[PDB]
Design a protein around this ligand. Structure first.
Ligand code: CLA
Ligand code: CLA
Ligand code: CLA
Ligand code: CLA
Ligand code: CLA
Ligand code: CLA
Ligand code: CLA
Ligand code: CLA
Ligand code: CLA
Ligand SMILES: CC1=C(/C=C/C(C)=C/C=C/C(C)=C/C=C/C=C(C)/C=C/C=C(C)/C=C/C2=C(C)CCCC2(C)C)C(C)(C)CCC1
Lengths: 141, 339, 338, 330
């Protein structure tokens, strides 16, 4: 319920501080736009937006929409980095392709990473994502 | 089902529904369970939102979609467009939910007890065994389904004329219609202004004219097989007939999304809300005219903006299967970008 | 039971109740002990409720569910509905405690003294032996039980017509139903508004029509066994007969949950509580009309919401057992994901 | 007794009373020693409670276990409150002490003079020999024992209206019940509301119908042998016949435990104690509603709570014998 978190539209600490919001960019109304945007959040006793991350879809834009947007991009960086590393491993000189990146091969993989979650599920089902424990270098216990 | 020549396509778990496309008995079992799940949603979510219904507020602003559908048919509505009876919504929400249990049983019957292929069965199930490359069998299936869609449209015309009465959004009351239109010229004139008809006596007469057309169309498809010109120009594969269905129901989705947002007759404003402005941004979306705050989207902005995306992603689903039916391997995209 | 592929399968202690499905003597001993435990609950919780009963408040809000059923019969009130005599409540719970000791006697008799299989007995013990492949013996068991259920429904209408009468809520007094219902057109029309009944005279003639029907089906199943109409369409396995009874009692439990939410005559409002609007959330439930203090749900809401969850899980247990009887081993689902 | 899977078991010192279960002479000697200790407990603890009896105080607070039973029969009671005379209570316990010495004399008589098996001797003495597998003499023993309990209930009928009167808790100057409520319909409906009694004519009339049934069935078991249907369903063994009586005594003990705490007419709170209530839970026990002065429990509390635990341990003691008679386990 967050009884100790008043909304920022009815928070007197935020209302006395939103009129003195500074401009972060060259726009002279940057502090006014931030005052209207942060009014919909939940504020504490010091009039700053406290974010709720527990899983409520009312506060889905606090963490879940950052979570969905991050994991897509971070999955994209990991998947095209993994797929480039697999492709250059089959070449004559796999070592030199890491310090001297085959840039046309890199752009080909990086634009193909928009369908990484469908490619990750399919490669997990095919067994080419996860290696078996018998086929991996192992410490001597 | 498109196999690309390979007779032994195994299919993974994400494409696991493609495994029974050549199996007639399992084709029934998944589709009957779909109708079990469809009638369960018509039953449970009628009973879900009749518990959430507040009779003092308008049901459009509450965010309810199934009670305005039954209220437009003329159940539970008094003389002022309000809701006074919670019982006919409870009966219809119970009748759909019990019929979902009969369908949910018959799907488990066709999964377990009935054979996977109906060619093995002897009796009437051998006549029900359909193959995808048999056009004469598919028109019998199509003609019988056109009979029930024609009987459904005549039942709605029957419900308005005799078995009760429809709602009149102009006079804000439930009105029993009498003697609808019979001239074919006004229905032919309704191709232009289809979304602004504003007349019960032409809506029912249009449903009479399409009810007689679908039943007469189902007579022709049962009695007469495909002639041969349709076999030359249309494909008769498993994914090809699904492609025509996904394309056909995407066009019906786009019409019903547009008809929900601008028409006031079949979607009255005291049951649903104000007629939506056709906005467009990075996607087309029908926005609220009155713009009720706190993310309201008053129950016509949920019907119209879901039946556009579900029509768009069936238009994408029609394009996925028609490309598969015509012979595109879809792995040739990956070899196009290979070195 | 099922015997998947091969026979002589064994069951662990968490599934040990399935070992005596083929044993006729232990099948009696488990079921009679269930009736012993059921009649013990019908007797001891009649005594538990009357020790906790206070006549100052209403009948429904105190959390007593058994004594409203006897008060509906007319065995708790003489006038007003205040429940002034607890003597007919004491004779019922003492009889059910006596009958539970009788049913506790024969249940422990059939698991220690009588043989575990009745096929080794001679005389009348051979005639009581049954197996899950003989429809003629199963028709004998079903026909005799249907005679008892038909006599049970006739004894309610017989008591309502000649031995005191039922409690009628629209007049708030017990009355005689000496003029019964004998026209089956009104019973056939009662398929729709069964739970909106407001006639005690139409209800008693329903149980007359029910009780004359289940003795008609009781007589029919004795002298005529199941035949080729019923053998080809219904499986006769050990779990198959259980599966039909599981969904059969779940269908009865769903009606009894709905009949305990909107009825005012067979569930009077001063005995059980006010009638409930049918709500639905994550799961369906019957919420209270008014919120009683310290969230004490009324006995009508305690009966209807518990019988709904019992009938849902008995439908799910019917689905577990009908799948197990037909041949689904519940391991093909995981093998398709490979 | 039921030998566990063999013919003869050499029982140890701990289970020493299982050794004589097939011996007829020691069966008589041990059982009349139990009756000697029962008559000693009826006799010595009658006089023990007289020596600790103050008539000024309430009789229920002093833990009188045998005095309120003798006050119920009416041996010298007072209508003005406290019981007047003491010598009727003295002579009853003195008679039981005499009979305990007589029964204790028969305990040593059949121990030493008589053999362990009553078949070596003869001359109208072999008729007093029983075998657990023989039904005929066990019906003779059961028929003769029911004749005394039929006469024992008839002795209360002789006491109520030919040899005295019965103390009535309502009138308080006896009742002298001459013609009781001899209704078969009343006693048939009294199977359920037996917790409270409103008239002692139902008690005297109930003892008429019990005693005529007991002397009716007592002379019936004498004439005929046990039937084959009773032989079929009931095991005729030493531990089996013990299990049948241990079930019935534990059934009688649970009724006697319940009847103590709830009855006010034949158990009057003038000299027994105020009534109690059943406290369910982990230990179902009867707790006093009345407040005793310094950490005490009344006589009705002591009778009801002991007989509930004694019938419960007889119920568990019956389960040890009935499972052994059926050979199921241990
Ligand atoms: C509307 C929902 C729906 C419906 C009604 C069906 C119906 C069907 N699917 Mg299915 N499925 C669905 C959703 C659905 N699917 C989704 C969401 C997935 C992806 C997770 C799949 C993936 C899938 C697989 C992997 C396969 C099926 C197959 C089947 C059939 C299994 C029963 C059968 O023929 O017995 C006879 C079946 C067998 C002898 C072998 C299959 C064994 C079990 C019963 C498969 C059940 C998987 C189950 C449906 C997955 C649940 C997904 C979801 C509902 C939670 C049935 C006709 C199977 C099939 O056609 O094989 C012939 C098949 O192998 N399904
Ligand atoms: C709407 C889809 C659909 C389809 C096309 C089928 C098809 C068929 N049904 Mg049916 N069935 C379905 C839904 C459907 N059913 C459902 C919802 C239930 C529950 C009411 C059943 C329960 C049912 C039974 C119990 C039987 C069939 C059987 C039949 C066969 C034809 C019998 C006939 O001509 O009847 C006239 C055929 C396999 C029979 C068969 O051959 O199966 C073994 C059979 O035994 N059906
Ligand atoms: C839900 C709609 C439905 C479906 C899916 C079909 C499907 C089919 N119809 Mg049609 N039909 C229907 C309703 C339907 N019909 C009704 C309502 C009528 C009007 C009375 C007819 C009368 C009709 C005729 C007159 C013929 C078809 C034919 C065709 C085929 C060619 C389609 C066409 O003309 O392209 C544009 C196609 C397989 C042709 C055929 O050979 O049948 C297979 C053909 O000659 N249909
Ligand atoms: C009329 C009732 C009925 C009958 C006679 C059977 C009979 C049987 N079923 Mg069962 N089944 C049914 C209904 C029934 N079931 C229901 C309603 C369910 C749904 C949950 C199932 C689900 C089911 C499963 C999942 C399995 C069976 C199994 C079994 C067998 C052994 C059961 C056993 O040993 O119990 C053992 C009992 C326990 C270990 C105790 C568990 C207690 C849980 C926690 C529930 C406790 C009650 C809960 C707190 C609610 C209280 C309600 C309140 C009002 C008091 C036996 C043939 C087994 C079988 O056939 O395969 C071998 C098996 O695996 N059944
Ligand atoms: C409503 C309660 C109910 C009732 C009426 C019964 C009824 C039956 N159970 Mg039981 N059971 C129940 C609940 C119930 N159970 C629950 C919830 C469990 C899970 C803990 C089981 C698990 C269970 C097992 C494991 C076994 C039974 C068996 C027995 C039958 C004979 C017992 C006997 O004489 O042993 C005679 C037994 C033998 C000669 C050898 C089997 C050895 C096992 C370990 C003996 C277990 C018996 C035990 C006392 C039964 C109750 C279990 C538990 C409630 C204490 C009897 C008809 C037995 C059976 O099927 O007979 C073959 C048996 O094996 N049941
Ligand atoms: C309600 C279920 C029921 C059923 C199906 C049976 C069935 C059986 N019992 Mg019975 N019995 C039960 C419960 C049940 N009993 C109970 C509640 C008791 C009363 C305490 C007994 C006490 C009992 C005795 C006294 C005897 C039987 C016997 C019998 C057999 C023949 C009875 C006869 O001819 O009837 C008419 C038969 C196997 C006899 C048998 O075969 O035992 C080995 C036997 O001696 N039963
Ligand atoms: C009608 C009553 C009755 C009869 C005549 C018998 C007769 C028999 N039982 Mg017994 N039994 C009964 C009731 C009865 N039992 C009860 C009440 C119990 C539950 C406790 C059992 C449980 C039982 C067991 C567990 C055993 C028998 C065995 C025996 C045999 C020998 C007993 C022996 O040597 O005593 C010797 C007695 C003692 C050594 C005394 C026990 C020591 C306790 C702790 C003394 C204190 C008792 C108590 C706390 C005092 C409370 C005083 C208070 C009331 C004021 C004999 C055939 C034995 C048998 O057959 O072997 C397999 C055997 O082991 N029975
Ligand atoms: C109510 C109390 C009571 C009664 C009256 C009985 C009665 C009997 N017991 Mg005893 N006993 C009791 C409780 C009782 N017991 C308890 C609680 C224990 C367990 C500690 C025993 C353990 C016990 C044993 C070990 C045996 C007896 C035996 C005897 C019988 C033969 C005595 C005899 O003839 O002497 C003269 C003795 C003989 C002719 C030979 C018998 C063998 C020995 C010497 C008996 C003496 C054992 C013991 C000291 C007796 C007193 C036990 C206890 C009271 C101190 C006698 C009828 C015997 C029996 O069952 O007879 C076969 C037997 O061997 N008792
Ligand atoms: C269980 C109690 C009971 C029973 C039924 C027996 C049974 C018996 N007594 Mg006995 N008796 C008992 C208690 C009992 N007595 C007691 C308490 C005393 C009083 C002290 C005696 C003293 C007594 C004498 C003096 C004699 C009998 C005799 C008899 C035998 C034949 C009776 C008769 O007159 O034949 C007809 C028989 C074994 C005689 C016998 O056989 O002695 C061994 C014998 O001499 N009894
Ligand atoms: C084929 C298949 C499948 C599918 C299936 C499904 C998914 C279906 C569903 C089904 C269903 C889903 C059905 C239905 C049912 C229902 C129910 C079960 C319900 C219940 C309830 C009732 C019956 C009642 C109610 C009520 C009323 C009406 C009135 C008021 C009161 C109450 C509430 C009581 C799967 C995938 C799995 C697998 C494979 C095969």
């Amino acid at each position: 319920d967050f009884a100790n978190l008043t909304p920022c539209s009815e928070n007197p600490a935020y209302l006395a501080k939103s009129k003195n919001f500074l401009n972060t960019t060259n726009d002279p109304n940057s502090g006014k736009i931030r005052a209207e945007r942060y009014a919909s959040a939940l504020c504490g006793p010091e009039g700053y937006p406290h974010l709720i991350v527990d899983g409520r879809f009312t506060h889905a834009g606090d963490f879940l929409i950052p979570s969905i947007l991050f994991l897509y991009i971070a999955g994209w960086i990991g998947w095209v980095g993994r797929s480039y590393l697999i492709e250059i491993r089959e070449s004559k000189n796999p070592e030199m392709q890491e310090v001297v990146i085959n840039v046309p091969l890199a752009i080909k993989k990086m634009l193909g990473g928009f369908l990484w979650p469908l490619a990750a599920v399919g490669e997990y089902t095919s067994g080419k994502l996860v290696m078996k424990d018998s086929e991996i270098p192992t410490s001597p216990r | 089902m498109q196999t690309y020549g390979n007779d032994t396509v195994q299919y993974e778990w994400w494409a696991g529904n493609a495994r029974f496309a050549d199996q007639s008995g399992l084709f029934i079992a998944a589709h009957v369970a779909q109708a079990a799940l469809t009638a369960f949603w018509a039953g449970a979510f009628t009973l879900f939102e009749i518990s959430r219904f507040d009779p003092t507020q308008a049901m459009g602003d509450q965010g309810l979609i199934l009670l305005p559908h039954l209220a437009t048919l003329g159940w539970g509505v008094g003389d002022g467009g309000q809701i006074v009876d919670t019982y006919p919504y409870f009966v219809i929400g119970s009748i759909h939910l019990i019929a979902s249990a009969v369908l949910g049983a018959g799907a488990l019957f066709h999964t377990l007890r009935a054979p996977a292929d109906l060619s093995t069965l002897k009796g009437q199930g051998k006549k029900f065994h359909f193959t995808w490359e048999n056009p004469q069998q598919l028109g019998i299936i199509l003609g019988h389904h056109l009979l029930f869609l024609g009987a459904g449209a005549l039942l709605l015309a029957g419900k308005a004329m005799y078995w009760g009465g429809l709602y009149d959004a102009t006079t804000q009351t439930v009105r029993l219609v009498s003697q609808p239109t019979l001239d074919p010229l006004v229905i032919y004139g309704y191709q232009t202004h289809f979304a602004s008809i504003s007349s019960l006596e032409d809506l029912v007469g249009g449903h009479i004219f399409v009810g007689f057309l679908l039943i007469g169309g189902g007579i022709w498809h049962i009695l007469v097989p495909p002639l041969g010109w349709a076999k030359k120009v249309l494909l008769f594969s498993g994914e090809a007939i699904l492609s025509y269905s996904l394309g056909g129901i995407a066009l019906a989705g786009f019409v019903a999304a547009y008809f929900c947002a601008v028409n006031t007759l079949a979607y009255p404003p005291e049951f649903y809300g104000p007629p939506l402005a056709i906005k467009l941004g990075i996607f087309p979306y029908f926005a609220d005219t009155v713009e009720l705050p706190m993310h309201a989207h008053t129950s016509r902005a949920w019907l119209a903006n879901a039946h556009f995306f579900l029509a768009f992603f069936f238009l994408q689903g029609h394009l996925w299967h028609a490309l598969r039916a015509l012979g595109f391997d879809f792995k040739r995209v990956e070899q196009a970008f290979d070195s």
